[PDB]
Amino acid sequence: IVGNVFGFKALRALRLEDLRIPPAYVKTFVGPPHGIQVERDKLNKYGRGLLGCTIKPKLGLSAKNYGRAVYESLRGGLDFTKDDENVNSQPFMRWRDRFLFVAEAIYKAQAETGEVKGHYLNATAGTCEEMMKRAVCAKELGVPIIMHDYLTGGFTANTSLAIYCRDNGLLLHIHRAMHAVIDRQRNHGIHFRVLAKALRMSGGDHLHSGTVVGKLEGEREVTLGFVDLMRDDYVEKDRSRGIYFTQDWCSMPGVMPVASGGIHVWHMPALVEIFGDDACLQFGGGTLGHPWGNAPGAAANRVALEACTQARNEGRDLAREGGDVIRSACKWSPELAAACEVWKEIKFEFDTIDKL
Amino acid sequence: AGFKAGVKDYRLTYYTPDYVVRDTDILAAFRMTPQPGVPPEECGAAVAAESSTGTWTTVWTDGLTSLDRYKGRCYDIEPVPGEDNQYIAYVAYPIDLFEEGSVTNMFTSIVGNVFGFKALRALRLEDLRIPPAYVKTFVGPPHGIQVERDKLNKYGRGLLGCTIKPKLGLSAKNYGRAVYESLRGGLDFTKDDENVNSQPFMRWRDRFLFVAEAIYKAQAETGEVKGH
Amino acid sequence: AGFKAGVKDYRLTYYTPDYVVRDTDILAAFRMTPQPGVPPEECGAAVAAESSTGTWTTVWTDGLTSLDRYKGRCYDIEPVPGEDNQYIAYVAYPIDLFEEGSVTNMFTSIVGNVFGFKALRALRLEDLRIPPAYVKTFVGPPHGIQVERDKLNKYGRGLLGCTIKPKLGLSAKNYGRAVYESLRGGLDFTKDDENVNSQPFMRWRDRFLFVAEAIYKAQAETGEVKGHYLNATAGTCEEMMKRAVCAKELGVPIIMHDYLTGGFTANTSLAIYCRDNGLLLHIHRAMHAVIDRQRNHGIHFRVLAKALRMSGGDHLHSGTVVGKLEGEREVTLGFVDLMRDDYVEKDRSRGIYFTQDWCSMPGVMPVASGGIHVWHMPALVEIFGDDACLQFGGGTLGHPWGNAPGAAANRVALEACTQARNEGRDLAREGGDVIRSACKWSPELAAACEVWKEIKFEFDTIDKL
Amino acid sequence: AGFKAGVKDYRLTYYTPDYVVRDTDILAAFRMTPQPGVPPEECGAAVAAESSTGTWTTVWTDGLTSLDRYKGRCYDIEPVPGEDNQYIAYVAYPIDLFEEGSVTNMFTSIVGNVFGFKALRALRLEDLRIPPAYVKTFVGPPHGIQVERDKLNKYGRGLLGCTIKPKLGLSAKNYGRAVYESLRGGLDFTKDDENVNSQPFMRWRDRFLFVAEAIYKAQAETGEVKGHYLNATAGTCEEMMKRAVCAKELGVPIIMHDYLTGGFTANTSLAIYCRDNGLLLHIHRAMHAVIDRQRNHGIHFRVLAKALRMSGGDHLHSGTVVGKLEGEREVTLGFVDLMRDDYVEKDRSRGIYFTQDWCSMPGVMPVASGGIHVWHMPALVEIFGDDACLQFGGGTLGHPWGNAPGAAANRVALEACTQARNEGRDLAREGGDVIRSACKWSPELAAACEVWKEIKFEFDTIDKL
Amino acid sequence: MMVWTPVNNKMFETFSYLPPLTDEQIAAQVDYIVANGWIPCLEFAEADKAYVSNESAIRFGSVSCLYYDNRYWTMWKLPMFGCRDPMQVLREIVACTKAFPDAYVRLVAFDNQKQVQIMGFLVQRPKTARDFQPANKRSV
Amino acid sequence: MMVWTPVNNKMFETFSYLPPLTDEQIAAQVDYIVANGWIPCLEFAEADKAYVSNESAIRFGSVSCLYYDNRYWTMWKLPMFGCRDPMQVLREIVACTKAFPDAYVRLVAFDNQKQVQIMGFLVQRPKTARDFQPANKRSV
Ligand SMILES: O=C(O)[C@@](O)(COP(=O)(O)O)[C@H](O)[C@H](O)COP(=O)(O)O
Ligand SMILES: O=C(O)[C@@](O)(COP(=O)(O)O)[C@H](O)[C@H](O)COP(=O)(O)O
Ligand SMILES: O=C(O)[C@@](O)(COP(=O)(O)O)[C@H](O)[C@H](O)COP(=O)(O)O
Ligand SMILES: [Mg+2]
Ligand SMILES: [Mg+2]
Ligand SMILES: [Mg+2]
Ligand SMILES: [Mg+2]
């Protein structure tokens, strides 16, 4: 479908907007290792969005300090932390050292809180053999979850890893590194909804969906459309959301959307409103940037999320009463108050490139 | 120099116009189109930060390590002639940032996230300087031009190939039939079309076998080494 | 320029005094003693030729390739002050000459044949400049100083080790008995002696199991992480691996390898295995002094140390300066830096002929071992700092009260000196006082001080600068 | 006797001049240079202690075992004629001390630490008596001289080889080209240069393939069995094996290993692989002269040769006596016997300190290589006899007419000399005449004799008896 | 700066980071279950079976990934299929806590279309529990 | 001959074989941190989390090498980046020990060039600890 046609001299630009994957083809795919339902059930987590966090700085931390940051974030109330997409294995931190220290951190946080914890260990590597070695180590440490950059690693490697995860009970978090090289421009490339469909077929329990409100581009209506395509069994043709075709997934598990990138406590109401409970909300700088360290940073995000969840369950409209809910929770939680004070004026409002 | 929470400009840490690039640094040249009211210096610094060590707000963990050692650096910004709002931003990445022998990792850092930033309208990676010290960590091409010519015993002219058509729809026997007839005429190579893998109309192992027969028949006929 | 058969001077092709070295070249510094009537230039050129591309007579096959691109180059010759017939010849080898990741190959070119040449009387490799571009082709040490400290949860002081004695003759049970008693007194590590492998009096697997029991008992008793360097050194790679596999399956922290007697090929293999399975690898330098003792001939230890760093090892023996085995102070401080640091500047007064850039390859922990006891503690802490392992074999198992008090004595002495340095006391000068203050305070230390008070190792240094 | 802490003289336990050596003991002959004011007895005792069971202070653990049973014993000390401060110290090691089948372990004990002792100025291991009871624990060489000749179907003359040149820089195709042209002229073997492994200019698998093509073409053309020592020397055991595996799968006769730069552990693994798969194994002694060149310090090559025989090799380089690399005649004849024969008598005039009984372990084929040409042929046949391989790298690839005539010249010279010896001619005195008679008859030989006529390698010998 | 305490600060998943739910707030969550047509259910566990643990993994090979003991609690009666009365749920909380006054008790609800628990929160902990902090003592 | 006791003689890494540190001796160690420009930091742990242990390994295959639980302790606030005042460190010790009087507390320092903890020692043990000996009762 996208092999040669984009390079033709006879056309100036070409963009693949949508694919209709028929049930007869969908059935030939193993698909995601577990999917939203199974994931919640294995983690024993229900009734709210999941909270994650990318360790920072992106690169440069040692394995021990990596685990240190992981422990302090997890114990504060985050469900997950993660390797940054470009954290693989490097001179400053080798992968196996990281895996071990992170395992220590996962198990310490879990015993401390009484809640199941995990950290997306990056299996992304130069070769399939390296990727698999990393997956094998995670399996042998008994940890819940690993990650893969499916576009920079590639679909062939990704499908392999997804099948391995299925066969050994590992959750697989997908990072979409490189997507915006392909999907940013309206006139040329492949729209993310297609890259998202591809991933669902290839295999992933989580896939990054954008935030709409954070540092990276994502138009609201278009995002709501492909989130449905990632999560639901059946999505009707709907041109106002960029859905060109009715899509029948014929019982293939849904992929958990991950909202990540320049979000903080004030964005929590908008985030819960866009995604609902079936999503993962990730705060890298929004946790490691807290004035009191990772644990209070995590507690602030956990409190914000739960406050908004409670409010929505009580019939409050998060689109309008969002600010009030956060402020009420501020006056009550000092961790949250500190977070709200630091990021109060911070917004990401620019003109949208990828329009309908 | 303590920990100070909050957002600050990327340029404060990531724009270093006086930096003297190292011989082991990976260098990138980005064609950069920033949003209105975003200075080129801040846009280049954002690209440098979010493809190396930095995020959108200050993190305390920076102090545990040495940002000076690991940070990507926007070290030069070039205006594009004929363009009001286009720049070439040069970024330097220390060799420590990369996994040895992994194109995947290099791509993940350099082109991973930065293309989707709200603060830019468009971004294009134009070139990379891969330093010898990084090149040496790769196995690289299985054989390359010299070895290939030596193994095929072919010198003094371009090689000739040919893609079997129609792209899809042909049976393995007919694929082998077309391969034989093309090779025996003087072509050194034929090839599967890029989308010919294994499909209901032709399974791969069937094709490989019939093609093998075609290769060996053409080779015996012409007395020249043949491949597909 | 055609093919002309016959013999001609090496210097015509291989002596290039105007050559500007490249940042990717491997550089060698040879201490060269030519035969009478052999010019230094021709001798250096011969060493360059026969360790790179050339042989004794012109060959036609040169024309098929580009000698310019591949030839080793003697680019500088330095007279040695105080010597009538000794020169430092500098040779530059293009990076293309070497197999990526292979210390074996590097040694095979640079030190393979040239030392046996009739045209020279003696030859010594003093130093090597391993360029970053070549360093990056090596997996290197499994963990290195930082990671090791992090995994063991040990900071702020030198590590303490101990070689079980007698070298040979102990049964596996008694080995474990000696190990338990030494670890429980305050030592972080004990070790197999370099020649303890598998023998009629003690088979390796029996030892590994009893030692594991000893490690875990001492650890439970003290609440400090403990280890014992189990020797994987064996007759074949298969045996070596079997032993590493068993350690892995016992969950113990650390193994050891004699990298020169086992060899670079075996050692790299073991380092890679240790990387993939999270074992610390302690490197014993058994045999080094056969190679590195004499000033006129051989390979200096700093090169053997560089070679090990590339091949892989978390620990490497460095010498003691003050113990039973030779090691001159300034030379030792020089190669300790080369073992540990990321970047070491040219420094001829410490034997460092070239600036060495390690391009982030992990540092190797120096191990000071051989004939040391409690009175050496101040000097040892002063020479090495905290990033070292200090080993007392006889200095532990020779204590009048047994291994546990022996260990406590060494641990007290180490911690006393460390505390004293941290407070601003000069260990070079106040060393005896620090030990004496600790003596009046710790009876275990007192007993050690009394027994070894008069014991010194002061002999004329053979390997001089 | 109870446990008494503290330092005492080594000689009290480890100098035993009345000891009667056992037929299972490993014996060692050390050339010993003690520091001023260290008695020879105490110095020889230190060597014996620190290479067996003892350390620098008394340890209590001795009492748990039997020092009498395990201790190494200095049992004789011999003055060196012409030397004020040099001794031969004889040490006896009980067989219990050694791991069966492991040269690595033997080397670790005997040469591990003692060479670095402050109490001595220099030390050299001259010889080892390997008892039959220990010899039998080693798999040994994969085939040996008898079996090799039988598999190659070659009898009644020395074997002829040739190292491809330039050392480095040739492509895989040109490598095979050079190999084909050399083999087809009458050489039995060609070889990778010792430092030819796998490199940017030529990857190993490409070379193996082209060389195989060259071996099979030359064999088909001449009707004689042909081989090329493909180098399996590598950075890791895994890489070494992959190279061995490829050769096996190509059906070629012979591979090679650099046993000192690769290491004994790797070498033994490869030798066992070659045994199990029927590959001949050529051993290159790269690095040996770093260890064995100097009279006062190191390990003499005869020990390195014994070690190789135990570890495993079908070929081992022995020196040429007459070529570019050092090798004194009488000493060479001595270790050649030690490599080849079943039983060698004590003979001090040839450097043989001990009667050596090899108990039927196969003999290793000596390889004379390095700066030799057609005029050396008589002297070479005279020194080595038929059971040797003679190698001409430069002497083949340096011929004015190319590799084939170069090989034909060497083959003619060898066969002329072999014929002459068989006829009763004295090669020591009639050597030049035999070559000249063959010159006037063979134009390929004549061209070779013309080019190298005046070329000799005559320098003062460093390693003397 | 305030420090999040690691000592006796165990949590209980959804809503445990908020101030303890009032009867009015519990009632509002129950209304949310009914309004959406979800199936209310009660589950309970003794103290020792309350928190996730690893004891069964002693019987495993390398297959402990996402296995934990104590995820399953004991069902109180049956899920209240077709329940359209919030008071009915509240009375079941009273009955369940009366029968097991020393147990952890949680209210859950199921969606049968997705076939998954769609909400849940703790409604009782034993009064002897000493492994948790009040909201204002969670940081020091 | 005196015998090193195996009973209730647990140690605590660096400096635990010396007599307990006086306030003057702690102060000199803090001066050493400052003089060298290292980053001071406090860590703490309750009694059950103080010593290295193995419990997690139940979940492992054959990968327990150099894995121990309880190496990580809980961070007190944040590492004192840019701190050049010894009094500031000493006040944080008082603050930390006041908030957690029943915890083990150790002072550590980080070097950011090497990226490793460069020093560390125990500053407080709970007064209920029975698993340690005074210096003069370590041998009998
Ligand atoms: O590298 C980063 O910037 C992040 O770790 C976020 O960090 P912060 O939480 O500190 O912003 C994520 O990978 C991006 O969200 C990826 O973008 P997307 O989800 O759009 O694919
Ligand atoms: O066998 C020995 O003598 C030792 O165990 C030390 O024992 P003691 O502690 O009882 O002296 C060491 O292996 C040597 O230090 C090696 O020398 P080096 O470190 O110089 O390589
Ligand atoms: O590299 C070389 O110099 C050789 O190939 C000889 O080349 P030429 O035939 O062209 O001289 C051999 O490796 C040496 O003989 C090794 O020395 P030794 O056998 O003494 O170990
Ligand atoms: Mg990221
Ligand atoms: Mg095509
Ligand atoms: Mg030893
Ligand atoms: Mg050679």
CATH assignment of the domain containing D231: 3.20.20.110
Cα distance between residue B134 and residue C100, in whole Å:
12
Tell me the sheet residues that pair with D14: none
Cα distance between residue C141 and residue C267, in whole Å:
11
Best CA proximity match to C88, nearest among C31, C11, C28 = C31
Exposure on the CB side of residue C412, measured as CA atoms within 13 A: 31
Asked if C136 and B100 come within 8 Å (Cβ–Cβ), the reply is yes
Q: Which residue in the block uniquely carries the two structure tokens 């009260």?
A: C401
- Estimate to the nearest angstrom the gap between the alpha carbon of A307 and the chain centroid: 21
Best CA proximity match to D24, nearest among D359, D346, D268 = D359
Same domain, C413 and C430: yes
Same domain, C120 and C178: no
Best CA proximity match to D388, nearest among D436, D352, D465, D335 = D335
Instruction: Identify the DSSP state of B199.
Output: B
Annotated binding residues of A: 4, 54, 58, 82, 84-85, 176, 208, 260
The nearest CA of chain D is from the CA of C297 a distance in Å of: 7
Residue type, F80: M
Tell me the two tokens of residue D337. 């016997």
Instruction: Identify the DSSP state of C361.
Output: P
- Of C123, C138, C153, the domain-final residue: C138
Return the residue whose CA atom lies nearest to atom 8 of ligand 1: A284
User: Cβ of D50: how many Cβ atoms within 10 Å?
Assistant: 26
Residue type, A38: V
Method used to solve the structure:
X-ray
- Beta strand extents in A275-320 (DSSP E only): 280-282
Task: Please return the burial class of B55, using the count of CB atoms within 10 Å of its CB with bins 0-12, 13-18 and 19+.
Answer: buried
Asked if F touches E (at least 3 Cβ pairs < 8 angstroms), the answer reads: yes
> Does a structural domain hold residue C465?
no
Of chain C, the end-to-end C-alpha distance in Å amounts to 45
Same domain, C283 and C415: yes
Parallel, antiparallel, or unpaired for β D120-129 and D26-34? Answer: antiparallel
Cα distance between residue A138 and residue F60, in whole Å:
10
Residues near D213 by beta carbon (within 8 Å), at least 6 away in sequence: D176, D180
3-state secondary structure (DSSP) of residue A122: strand
C147 touches chain A (CB under 8 A): yes
Best CA proximity match to D51, nearest among C287, C367, C292, C260 = C287
D321: region left, alpha or beta (phi > 0 left; psi from -120 to 50 alpha)? left
The CATH code of the domain at F2-140 is: 3.30.190.10
Tell me the sheet residues that pair with F111: F116
Q: Which residue in the block uniquely carries the two structure tokens 């819940």?
A: A144
- Of D83, D117, D138, the domain-final residue: D138
Exposure on the CB side of residue F64, measured as CA atoms within 13 A: 19
Asked if F13 and C184 come within 8 Å (Cβ–Cβ), the reply is no
Domain that holds residue C82: 12-138
Least distant ligand from the CA of A176: 1
The sign of the CA dihedral A43, A48, A50, A56 is negative
CA gyration radius, chain C: 24
Q: Is the peptide bond before C142 cis (omega within 30 degrees of 0)?
A: no
Tell me the two tokens of residue D103. 């040269």
Residue type, B175: Y
Asked about A175 being catalytic, the answer comes back as yes
Q: Name which of E56, E66, E115 to mutate to probe chain A: the one with the most chain A Cβ atoms within 10 A of its Cβ.
A: E66
Contact B157, B183 (CB under 8 A): no
Domain residue ranges of chain F, discontinuous segments joined by +? 2-140
> Does a structural domain hold residue C206?
yes
* Exposure letters E76-105 (e unless 16+ CB within 10 A, then b): beebbeebeebeebbebbeebbeebeebbb
Instruction: Identify the DSSP state of A291.
Output: T
Cα distance between residue C221 and residue F11, in whole Å:
9
Cα distance between residue D400 and residue D406, in whole Å:
8
Same domain, C338 and C444: yes
Best CA proximity match to C253, nearest among C207, C190, C206, C309 = C190
Contact D65, D6 (CB under 8 A): no
Helix C377-384 crosses helix C403-423 at what angle (to 10 degrees)? Answer: 50
- Estimate to the nearest angstrom the gap between the alpha carbon of F121 and the chain centroid: 4
Contact A188, A13 (CB under 8 A): yes
Cα distance between residue C343 and residue B21, in whole Å:
18
- Side by side, which strands form the sheet with C73-79? C73-79, C87-93, C26-34, C120-129, C298-299
Cα distance between residue A31 and residue A198, in whole Å:
10
Contact C230, C252 (CB under 8 A): yes
| Atom number of ligand 1 nearest to Cα A58 | 1
Same domain, D156 and D121: no
Measured in degrees and rounded to the nearest 5, phi and psi for residue A134 equal: -60, -45
Best CA proximity match to A191, nearest among A201, A202, A199, A180 = A180
Instruction: Say how many domains are in chain D.
Output: 2
Helix A318-330 crosses helix A294-313 at what angle (to 10 degrees)? Answer: 130
Contact C392, C410 (CB under 8 A): yes
Helix C431-441 crosses helix C443-452 at what angle (to 10 degrees)? Answer: 130
CA gyration radius, chain D: 24
Tell me the two tokens of residue D30. 């050390």
Q: Which residue in the block uniquely carries the two structure tokens 């010896």?
A: D421
Cα distance between residue C366 and residue C358, in whole Å:
16
Measured in degrees and rounded to the nearest 5, phi and psi for residue A121 equal: -80, 125
The greatest distance separating any two alpha carbons of chain B, rounded to the nearest whole angstrom, comes to 79
Contact C259, D234 (CB under 8 A): no
Cα distance between residue D132 and residue A280, in whole Å:
73
Best CA proximity match to A210, nearest among B113, D315, B158 = B113
Tell me the two tokens of residue D296. 């006062």
Tell me the two tokens of residue D320. 């040429």
Task: Please return the burial class of D217, using the count of CB atoms within 10 Å of its CB with bins 0-12, 13-18 and 19+.
Answer: middle
Q: Name which of A46, A325, A332 to mutate to probe chain E: the one with the most chain E Cβ atoms within 10 A of its Cβ.
A: A46
Best CA proximity match to D142, nearest among D260, D316, D334 = D316
Same domain, C185 and C70: no
Asked if C touches D (at least 3 Cβ pairs < 8 angstroms), the answer reads: yes
Q: Which residue in the block uniquely carries the two structure tokens 């639980």?
A: F69
Q: Report CA(D33)–ligand 5 centroid distance (Å).
A: 77
Contact E30, A135 (CB under 8 A): no
Residues near D400 by beta carbon (within 8 Å), at least 6 away in sequence: C3, C5, D447, D451
Asked about D315 being catalytic, the answer comes back as no
Asked if C118 and D236 come within 8 Å (Cβ–Cβ), the reply is no
Give the C-alpha distances (Å, rounded to integers) separating D12 from B185, D34, D58, E68. Answer: 91, 18, 12, 65
Instruction: Identify the DSSP state of B156.
Output: S
B100 touches chain C (CB under 8 A): yes
- Of C138, C167, C183, the domain-final residue: C138
> Does a structural domain hold residue D368?
yes
The sign of the CA dihedral F50, F51, F55, F57 is positive
User: Percent helix, strand, coil in chain C (nearest 5)?
Assistant: 45, 15, 40
Q: Chain F contacts of E61, Cβ < 8 Å?
A: 61
Tell me the two tokens of residue B95. 């060799």
Asked if E touches C (at least 3 Cβ pairs < 8 angstroms), the answer reads: no
B23 touches chain C (CB under 8 A): yes
Cα distance between residue C328 and residue F87, in whole Å:
43
Task: Please return the burial class of B130, using the count of CB atoms within 10 Å of its CB with bins 0-12, 13-18 and 19+.
Answer: middle
Which residues crowd ion ligand 7, with CB under 5 Å? Answer: D 163, 193-194
Query: Which chain B residue's Cα is nearest to A89?
Result: B99
CA gyration radius, chain F: 17
In this structure, the dihedral spanned by the alpha carbons of residues D90, D95, D98 and D104, taken in order and rounded to 10 degrees, is: 50
Q: Which residue in the block uniquely carries the two structure tokens 């003062």?
A: D460
Residues near D280 by beta carbon (within 8 Å), at least 6 away in sequence: D142, D143, D148, D151, D227, D253, D254, D255, D274, D314, D315
Tell me the two tokens of residue F39. 């980053």
Which residues crowd ion ligand 5, with CB under 5 Å? Answer: B 163, 193-194
Best CA proximity match to C397, nearest among D159, E17, D58, A6 = D58
Contact B14, B40 (CB under 8 A): no
Cα distance between residue C366 and residue C193, in whole Å:
17
Cα distance between residue A242 and residue A229, in whole Å:
11
Give the C-alpha distances (Å, rounded to integers) separating A108 from A122, A141, B194, C373, C464. Answer: 20, 14, 50, 41, 54
Q: List, as one string, the DSSP characters of C424-464.
A: T--TTTSHHHHHHHHHHH-HHHHHHHHHHTT-------SS-
CA gyration radius, chain A: 20
Residue type, D281: L
Cα distance between residue A235 and residue A247, in whole Å:
5
Asked if A96 and C146 come within 8 Å (Cβ–Cβ), the reply is no
Q: List, as one string, the DSSP characters of A172-221.
A: EEEE-TTHHHHHS-SSSEE-HHHHHHHHHHH--SEEE---SSSSB---HH
Look up the CATH number of the domain holding residue B98.
Answer: 3.30.70.150
- Beta strand extents in chain A (DSSP E only): 15-16, 50-52, 80-82, 118-122, 145-149, 171-175, 189-190, 206-208, 234-235, 247-248, 256-260, 280-282
Cα distance between residue B127 and residue B124, in whole Å:
9
> Does a structural domain hold residue D460?
no
C360 touches chain B (CB under 8 A): yes
Cα distance between residue D365 and residue D279, in whole Å:
15
Tell me the two tokens of residue C374. 């409690």
Tell me the two tokens of residue E19. 């101030």
Best CA proximity match to E70, nearest among E115, E10, E118, E137 = E10
> Does a structural domain hold residue D465?
no
Choosing from C165, C173, C248, C297, the catalytic residue is C165
Contact D23, D130 (CB under 8 A): no
User: Percent helix, strand, coil in chain B (nearest 5)?
Assistant: 35, 20, 45
| Atom number of ligand 1 nearest to Cα A84 | 5
Is B113 a pocket residue for ligand 1 (Cβ < 6 Å)? yes
Same domain, D119 and D149: no
Give the C-alpha distances (Å, rounded to integers) separating B197 from A156, A197, B203. Answer: 13, 21, 8
Contact C444, C384 (CB under 8 A): no
Task: Please return the burial class of E113, using the count of CB atoms within 10 Å of its CB with bins 0-12, 13-18 and 19+.
Answer: exposed
Same domain, D172 and D63: no
Cα distance between residue A153 and residue A125, in whole Å:
7
Cα distance between residue E80 and residue E71, in whole Å:
21
Helix A294-313 crosses helix A63-74 at what angle (to 10 degrees)? Answer: 30
Measured in degrees and rounded to the nearest 5, phi and psi for residue D427 equal: -65, -30
Residue type, C338: L
Contact C73, C53 (CB under 8 A): no
Q: Which residue in the block uniquely carries the two structure tokens 């195989």?
A: D212
Residue type, F125: R
Is A75 a pocket residue for ligand 1 (Cβ < 6 Å)? no
Same domain, D87 and D228: no
Breaks (C-N over 2.5 A) in chain D follow: none
> Does a structural domain hold residue D372?
yes
Contact D393, D190 (CB under 8 A): no
Tell me the two tokens of residue D445. 């030989």
Cα distance between residue E92 and residue E43, in whole Å:
11
3-state secondary structure (DSSP) of residue D417: helix
Per residue, what are the HEC states of chain F? Answer: CCCECCCCCCCCCCCCCCCCCCHHHHHHHHHHHHHCCCEEEEEEECHHHCCCECHHHHHCCCCCCCCCECCCCEEECCCCCCCCCHHHHHHHHHHHHHHCCCCEEEEEEEECCCCEEEEEEEEECCCCCCCCCCHHHCEC
Query: Which chain C residue's Cα is nearest to F31?
Result: C423
Exposure on the CB side of residue C365, measured as CA atoms within 13 A: 28
Cα distance between residue D188 and residue D180, in whole Å:
11
Instruction: Identify the DSSP state of C35.
Output: P
The nearest CA of chain C is from the CA of B137 a distance in Å of: 5
Give the C-alpha distances (Å, rounded to integers) separating D227 from C414, D215, D245, F41. Answer: 62, 6, 16, 68
